[PDB]
Amino acid sequence: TFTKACSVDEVPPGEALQVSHDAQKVAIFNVDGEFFATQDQCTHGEWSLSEGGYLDGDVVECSLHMGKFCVRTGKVKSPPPCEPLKVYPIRIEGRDVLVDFSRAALHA
Numbered sequence: 430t431f432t433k434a435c436s437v438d439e440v441p442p443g444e445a446l447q448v449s450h451d452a453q454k455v456a457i458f459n460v461d462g463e464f465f466a467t468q469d470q471c472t473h474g475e476w477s478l479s480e481g482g483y484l485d486g487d488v489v490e491c492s493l494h495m496g497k498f499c500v501r502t503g504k505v506k507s508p509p510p511c512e513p514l515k516v517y518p519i520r521i522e523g524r525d526v527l528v529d530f531s532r533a534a535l536h537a
């Protein structure tokens with residue numbers, strides 16, 4: 430199941446939005462007009478990447494320790510995080526950005 434998360438126009442390029450499904454929080458990033466979904470919480474600590482992060486192209490920085498992650502793959506790009514982000518498949522259906530919330534994957 431792909432689930433309605435947000436509208437294409439709700440997240441302009443270079444920006445992030447937090448979405449909720451059941452008990453999980455997911456960050457939606459618009460990289461160059463394409464949408465990517467990762468876990469919202471940084472893996473290194475209790476800090477939100479959509480609300481406390483900064484998006485630099487396809488790379489999100491966590492403001493607490495300046496850890497960095499690729500939003501496309503979840504891959505750690507800069508320390509101190511040890512573990513990559515969960516990433517979730519994305520479908521665009523017209524205006525809708527859809528996330529498959531049950532289908533989290535990990536790079537490693």
Ligand SMILES: OC[C@H]1O[C@H](O[C@H]2O[C@H](CO)[C@@H](O)[C@H](O)[C@H]2O)[C@H](O)[C@@H](O)[C@@H]1O
Nearest residue numbers: 432433434435436437439446447448449
């Ligand atoms: O408030 C209940 C609804 O919450 C979500 O939808 C809101 O937030 C989205 C992303 O920020 C917006 O696209 C949407 O227009 C808002 O209504 C949730 O997706 C819905 O299923 C809930 O009914």
Ligand code: FES
Nearest residue numbers: 471474491494496
């Ligand atoms: S909490 Fe995100 S880098 Fe430490």
